[PDB]
Symmetry: none
Subunit: 106 residues, 6 copies
């Protein structure tokens, strides 16, 4: 229902990456989009807020939304997953992405 890409990422400190999720096999369009992060050692995924080095984009035309992270650090390693949900009674949904494992080296 939503294809998250890429599945694996390996980067060095200071660089940037970008995930992308696309809603497929649905008659509804994008509405509410979220991104989650699970750092190494964490016990509960934490929701990312849009701003500064965390740049989120939404393309309603192509049913795609992206997350860009700049100035990567070793602490940014972990798993990132997207979420798309809508409560529109004519076309409601709530689906998660396959996930992306990120490894930041130095």
């Amino acid at each position: 229902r939503v294809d998250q890409t890429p599945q694996t990422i390996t980067k060095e400190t200071g660089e940037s990456l970008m995930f992308t999720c696309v809603l497929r096999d649905s008659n509804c369009g994008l509405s509410r989009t979220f991104w989650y992060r699970t750092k190494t050692g964490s016990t509960n995924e934490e929701r990312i807020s849009k701003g500064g080095r965390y740049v989120e984009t939404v393309n309603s035309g192509s049913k795609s939304f992206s997350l860009r992270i700049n100035d990567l650090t070793v602490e940014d390693s972990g798993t990132y997953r997207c979420r798309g949900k809508s409560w529109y009674y004519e076309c409601p949904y709530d689906v998660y992405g396959g996930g992306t494992v990120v490894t930041v080296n130095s």
Copy 2:
């Protein structure tokens, strides 16, 4: 408000044995209604809904607000992440919540 505690968070098993996930509805006055389980195999880009039966044993305990998924005769290809889902459309107390997820790694030897 409404929540669901998926456990365990990490699992490592060998081929042929079995494992079991568990989700529990917390911080809500409503009971279980519709329950689902999703899995993302290595190499897949999305979550796929599991169809109960045979090797996939599903149980629901309305009394304790808990539902589980058991997989028997494990295989290396079953590695991946599994997440549960619980939803209800009852107009007096509707909800739609997902589990935290469980990363599964199946080895051999």
Copy 3:
């Protein structure tokens, strides 16, 4: 805006005879689901729901989105106002509408 066309608006009958109401769901893309009939006796601030039974026969035609109620062996006590109700909780097409009502007067001789 969806409604419900109840007919007839007024009824006058003698004891022992029968009458028939009819309600049709109009201006809606949703179909029939739950249908009910209510009664308000003369001298009351409340409403009592009618139960399907021998002399209280009800029919529903999902194809034409119409449901009717027939009452046999009328009595003077059957006088009052009758109104229908059609509701559905389907989250994709929910509704809850009442009929305009029908005033019934049962005489004798």
Copy 4:
């Protein structure tokens, strides 16, 4: 379940004067959100939605869960039945209910 008490049930007026309906959301934990008023002219079940302004005056009181419609400079053609509607799609407290209706007769 949630309903709506429309008052008054019958109104009879002469040309040129004004009337006022009132609807109140009852038996519900949700508050008012979207409110509308509809009209069915004499001789057909066809319904037209009323637009606020000019001769049509609408008010909403979220505190008391009440909304009203006032029609000024009544005319013989304004006779018919009027019914209100209050709905909300909030998934935590959704509803969509209509009023019992008010039969209006304008004489001269």
Copy 5:
């Protein structure tokens, strides 16, 4: 050159009774593997997956390449369109076909 013949095309029943659809894989060298049934309620434009159990009885006869669905204790809310689906990911001969559909109308009295 690989489809599925769904029958019957139209069904009309009363409340409380039962019905049965039937799908047969034709013009193919492959046998049945994964079978599903979907439901579209009146007013909606989205497909809903049917779950086995209770009044919903899904059967599969691999010998005759036929799978059926029987619904017991019918209700007015069961009206809508029903269509079947048969898919197999077997790398030697994969397929994924849907049924023509069946329009159901459930009345009362």
Copy 6:
């Protein structure tokens, strides 16, 4: 005793107008870091986080340790309770405090 004083306590407005809340961190040596605003619509059972943009304009003044939320083009649906939150995980000065809340009533006419 790090706290946060939310003002005003009650607001009454008409449709189309604007309002503004304000929260100030008091009795603490730490400065502002992460600021949020929550909303509880009539019927409650769940707090919703507000996202900056369009009609919701958020401001933060590190100098005066104050952050505000302004809502433009008010609607009857905007009635409810609004409360702020300010938290920081800085190991030298961490905190997590909520606002007292503001009851909003939006009328029309």
